[PDB]
Amino acid sequence: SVITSVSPKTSNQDHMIEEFIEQAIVFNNQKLESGVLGYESLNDLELG
Amino acid sequence: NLRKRNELKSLFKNKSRLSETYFVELIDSTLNKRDDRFHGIWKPGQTYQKGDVVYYNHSLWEMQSENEICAKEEQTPGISTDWKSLLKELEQKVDKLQHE
Numbered sequence: 001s002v003i004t005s006v007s008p009k010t011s012n013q014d015h016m017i018e019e020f021i022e023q024a025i026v027f028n029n030q031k032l033e034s035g036v037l038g039y040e041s042l043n044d045l046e047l048g
Numbered sequence: 049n050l051r052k053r054n055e056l057k058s059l060f061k062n063k064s065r066l067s068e069t070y071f072v073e074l075i076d077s078t079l080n081k082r083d084d085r086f087h088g089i090w091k092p093g094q095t096y097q098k099g100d101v102v103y104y105n106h107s108l109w110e111m112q113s114e115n116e117i118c119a120k121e122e123q124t125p126g127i128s129t130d131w132k133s134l135l136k137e138l139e140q141k142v143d144k145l146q147h148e
Contacts, residue, residue, distance in 0.1 A: 042068065043065065044065070045066040046063070046065050046066075047064050048062075048063075
């Protein structure tokens with residue numbers, strides 16, 4: 001085996017490149033804790 | 049100076065979110081032993097600054113030395129020459145008059 005590239009005239013596939021847009025970003029990162037001391041801003045402590 | 053216990057207790061309730069003004073009022077309304085110069089009872093292992101006031105046996109003492117010092121286990125207000133008090137000067141003077 002020998003590794004080469006993909007071409008639209010030897011196969012029908014190419015490299016797929018698209019543009020990144022800042023305002024359409026979604027994060028995938030969940031907080032480990034919530035609502036407890038040490039993990040929230042002072043504005044968000046509800047004094048339960 | 050601004051608020052009482054019954055006024056401060058009114059900002060912390062079963063359903064009350066926090067804010068910085070509550071802590072500002074909490075800090076201003078209690079006694080700050082560094083900024084108002086009063087430390088209560090003398091303790092060994094504490095550092096003091098010029099002007100501090102401390103209660104040792106039956107007297108209040110103000111520190112005279114201008115540089116920071118450390119409470120030595122041996123150096124106690126009355127033994128050393130850092131501290132000062134009037135209830136001892138006047139005591140000795142009146143004792144002298146009494147003896148004379």
